Design a protein around this ligand. Structure first.
Ligand SMILES: [Mg+2]
Ligand SMILES: [Mg+2]
Lengths: 288, 288, 288, 288
C-alpha cells in the first residue's frame, strides 16, 4: 500500500518558489515514511504554476528522490508537450495530467485527444489525475482503455468510483486522493495521494502499518481524528492551512502559498492552532 | 441595449496568435454595429492565454478601437497585477476579471481579497466577469457592494440572477453572457456579451434595432433561430465551431482555436456546415 | 397571454381541506383577472393530497369555473388512472401530471410509459407539469413528441428550456412557472403559472395588461418588486407564507397549509408582514 | 456488523400487495442470516405505499419476526402519526422515517418539527432514514443532536458522511445503504441496509463472516462482483430488476413492482438474465 504525497510548493513572500524549502520538506517526508511524491498536483498549486515553475520543481526534487510523478497539465497543449519532452530525459516514476479545465461543455473527444497526444510522445508511464470537483470533468474508463495508463489518482469522495477503475482497467494502479477516505483506500486500492501527508505523514504511515498488522480499530480511530481536522481546515482554506501546519507539526518553515491562494494571516494562523490543539494532542498520543 | 462581443483569439496551426486576423475580425464586427469588444473572455480563450498573449491581444485591438474591456484573470495575482499596471497606461473602457478558478472550496474572503487587489491598483473602471459554470464560484453582491464596480458581465442561464445585480447595485451596468437569452437581456439589462456576435453580429444588432422599434415578435423569431443554432454547436464544441462559422457567415479566415480546445477536423467542419445550412438560409432571409 | 394560478388548498387546523375557502378564493382570483386555475399543483400541495382530496378539490372548483387544469400525479398509476377516468366525465380544460418522483435513477422509459398510460385513457387535453427541482427528472421534448400534448407548465429558471418546448413541439402551449421570470414569460411564451398569483393577482394581471400596451418599463419595475418579495418569502417557506399573504393582501382567510408544510407561527406571520411592508407599499402605489 | 434488509413489497399484476409472498421471502432472508428487516424503505416502495399498505406490510412481517424497523414517512404528518400510534402497540425494533420530500426549498426547521412530532408520540426507538438523492434534503447532526435518535440509515455514496454521524452522535448506530460500499461499511460502521440482500443475502452475509475471520481479500472479491452487478442493473431499473433476480437466485416468485416503478417485460427479464449469467456463476463458485 503506497503512500504518495502531493507535495506543496513553498513560495516566499514575493511569490517566488523556494526550492531549498521544497527539498528540505521532501527529505523529511521520505524519512517519515512517504513512498513517493506527486509533483505539481493541486496541493502543489499545479495549475497556478508556470511551465518553468513546474519544471524547476521536478529538477529540485530529483536531487532528493527519483520516485516522482510529474504533473504537467495546462490549458495549452504545446506547453504540456514541452514538459513531456523535458521529462523524457529524467529518470522518474511517471508523467501525469488532470483533464482540461475551466471551459464548460467541451466534447468528451477533446479529453481523449488531449491524453492521446501526451501518450504519443511520453517515454514514461502515464498516470491520470482525475479530480472532477476541480476540472468539471470525470474521465471514464472507456476513454482510458485505449491509453497506456499505468496509474490513476482519483480525488473523489465515492470509493466505488475508484474501485471501478481497478475493475475495468486490469493491471492499472489506483490511488484515492481524499484525506477523509484514507482508511478505506488502504483497505482496497493501491494506495493514497492525500494532501495531509504534508503535515501528518507519520499518522498516515501509522494507519498503513497498523492495517498491515491487522489492527483496524486503531487505524479507524486515527481516521476519525483526521476527519475532524479536515472539517476545521476547510474554514481557513485547506491548502493554505497546510503551510501553517507543516511548520507546527514538522518544525521547519515552508513559506506561504501564492494568491489567489491567500496565506493565512498571523491572526488566522493563531486561531487555527488553537482549534486543532485538542486533536493534535490526541494524535500525538496515539502516534509517537 | 449594448451589444458587446467577447472576441475570439485567432491562432495559426502552430498555436501562435494571428494578430492580423484579429484586427480584421474586430474591424468587421465594429462596422456591423458591435458596441464594445471584451478581450480575453472565455470565448477569446482567456485562461488558456499566457500573460504576454493577453497583453498582445489588447495591443493589437488597441490599433483598431478604444472600445475595449480587458480581461486579465489568472491563477497568479502577481501576473494579474502586471497586466493591470500595463493597462493603466492605455485609454480603454475598463478592466475585468473572472474569479479564481480550478481550486475547489476556497473561502469567500479569498475571492474578496483577489478583487480588492485589482481595485487597489487599477486606474480603470472595474468590470466583474461572473461565470459560475466555468470558475465554480458565484460572486455575491455582498463582496460587490464593497468594490468600485462599474459593470458586471454575468454568464448565467438564470436571468433573475442577472436582474438581481441591477436591483442591488445601483448604477452598475449589467450584461448577460448567454446566447440563448439575448432577446430577454435586451429587454431588461444594459446589454449582452454574447459569443455568437463573432459570426452573426448583424443578426444580434438587428434584434436590438427591432426591439428599439417595438418589433418584438420579429426579434423573438431571430432568437428562436439562434437557439436552434446553439443546440447544433454543442456537439462540436461551441467555441471551436465559432471559428468555422466566422468564415462561413463573414467571409474571412480567423484560423483555429488552440488544443485542448481542439479545432474541428475537415470532416467535422463539413458536417457542421450541412447541419446549419437551413438555419443560415432562414437567418439571411430575415437579416440582409 | 394567459395568467394561470396554481391555487392553494386551504386546510383547517386539523388538516382537513376547507372547500368553502377554496371556492371563495377562486372566485376572487377570477374577479381580479386570473384566466385559469391549475388544481393540485405544487402550490396546491398536490403530492401531499390523497386521491380523494384531489378529486374533491376539482369538484369544488367546478362550481366556480370550468377553466381548470386537473393535476393527478401520484406514485401509484392505478390511482392516477382512477382520477383520469373521473375527470373524463367533467367539462374541464385538461388533465395534467408531474413526472414520477422520489425514486432516483428510474430509466427514462419509465417516464414515457407513465405518460403514455395517462394518454391512452384520458379524453381531455394532456398538459405536462415539468418541475425538475421537485421530481428530480426533466421531461425532454423527445418523450413528448409521441404524446398528444396540448400544454406544458415548466417550472424552470432557464427560460431557454421553456422556449425549446415551443420550438420542438409545434402548436403546444407553453407556460413558465417561475415567479421571478413572469415579465419574460409574458414577452415570449403562452403565459405563466406562477404561485404569487394567489396573493398579488392584480400585480401580475397589471404586468400583462401593461405589456399589451407596450409599457415594458412599468412591467419590469413590478418584476423587480416581485423578485424582492420572493427573496423574503423563501426564508419562511414560500408556500406557507402565501397563506398568510392571501389574508393580508386579499382580505379573507384561507386557513393553513398542512405539515410537513408547516404553517407560519403567529410570531413568524408578524415578522413576515413587517418585512414586506415597504414592498407592499410600493406595489399598492403602482397597482391601484 | 449487522446486515439489514430493506425488503421488497411483492405486488400482483393488478398492483395489490401479495403478503403471502412477502412472508415467504422474509423467512428465507432470515434463515440465510439477515439480522433485521427494514419495512417500507425505498426498496419496499415506501413513498408509493398508502398508509394502509404500510400498515399491512408490518402486520404480515410481524407474523414472521420481531426484528422489524417500521418506516412510516409520508407527505401528511397526520397519516404518519396514525402509523406511529399503530406501531406503538407492537413489539418491534424501532420506527423510522425519511425526511419530507418533493417540495423544494423547505426551511430546515420544517425538517426538525417533522421529526420532533414523531419523537413526541412514538414509544419506540427512533431511526432516521437519510437519503438525500431521493428526498432532496440531507439531515444534519444539528437537528439530530436534539432528538432521541437510536440509529441512522444513511443511503449515501460518500462514506465519510456516514462515518461523521458516528463521531458526532455518541452511541447512535449507523448503517450505510449503498450496495457498492458494503465492504467498507462492514469495516467501519454498525452495518448495512443494502437492497441487494433481497436476492443475494448469502453473499453479503458471507462478506460479513469473512471479515469477522480477517479474510478481507475474499470479502473484497465479492464486493467487486456486487459492483459489476450494480452497473448492469441500472439500465433496467434497480428495484424492478431485484424482483426478477429474487426468483433467479432464490427460487421463489415475489411478483412485480407497481408502476410508475414498471416491471421488466418478458424480454427485458431475459436480457437481464443473460447479462448477469457469468457473474452469477462466479458468485455461486465463491459462495455455496
Ligand atoms: Mg499600437
Ligand atoms: Mg399477526
Amino acid at each position: 500500500m503506497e503512500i504518495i504525497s502531493p507535495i506543496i510548493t513553498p513560495f516566499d513572500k514575493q511569490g517566488k518558489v523556494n526550492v531549498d524549502a521544497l527539498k528540505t520538506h521532501a527529505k523529511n517526508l521520505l524519512e517519515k515514511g512517504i513512498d513517493a511524491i506527486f509533483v505539481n498536483g493541486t496541493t502543489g498549486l499545479g495549475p497556478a504554476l508556470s511551465k518553468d515553475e513546474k519544471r524547476q520543481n521536478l529538477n529540485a526534487l530529483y536531487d532528493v528522490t527519483h520516485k516522482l510523478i510529474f504533473q504537467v497539465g495546462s490549458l495549452n497543449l504545446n506547453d504540456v508537450m514541452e514538459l513531456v519532452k523535458f521529462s523524457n530525459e529524467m529518470d522518474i516514476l511517471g508523467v501525469s495530467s488532470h483533464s482540461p479545465y475551466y471551459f464548460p461543455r467541451l466534447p468528451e473527444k477533446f479529453l481523449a485527444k488531449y491524453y492521446e497526444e501526451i501518450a504519443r510522445i511520453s517515454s514514461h508511464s502515464l498516470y491520470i489525475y482525475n479530480y472532477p470537483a476541480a476540472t468539471g470533468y470525470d474521465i471514464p474508463p472507456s476513454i482510458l482503455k485505449s491509453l497506456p495508463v499505468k496509474g490513476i489518482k482519483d480525488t473523489n469522495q465515492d470509493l466505488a468510483h475508484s474501485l471501478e477503475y481497478k475493475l475495468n482497467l486490469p493491471g492499472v494502479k489506483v490511488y484515492n486522493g481524499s484525506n477523509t477516505l484514507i482508511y478505506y483506500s488502504l483497505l482496497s486500492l493501491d494506495g493514497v495521494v492525500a494532501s495531509f501527508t504534508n503535515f501528518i505523514p507519520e499518522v498516515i504511515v501509522k494507519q498503513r502499518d497498523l492495517i498491515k498488522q491487522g489492527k483496524l480499530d486503531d487505524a479507524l480511530r486515527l481516521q476519525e481524528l483526521i476527519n475532524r481536522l479536515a472539517d476545521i481546515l476547510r474554514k481557513y482554506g485547506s491548502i493554505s492551512a497546510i503551510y501553517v501546519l507543516v511548520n507546527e507539526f514538522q518544525g521547519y518553515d515552508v513559506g506561504y502559498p501564492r494568491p489567489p491562494i491567500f496565506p493565512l494571516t498571523d491572526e488566522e494562523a493563531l486561531s487555527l492552532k488553537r482549534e486543532i490543539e485538542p486533536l493534535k494532542r490526541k494524535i500525538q498520543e496515539l502516534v509517537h
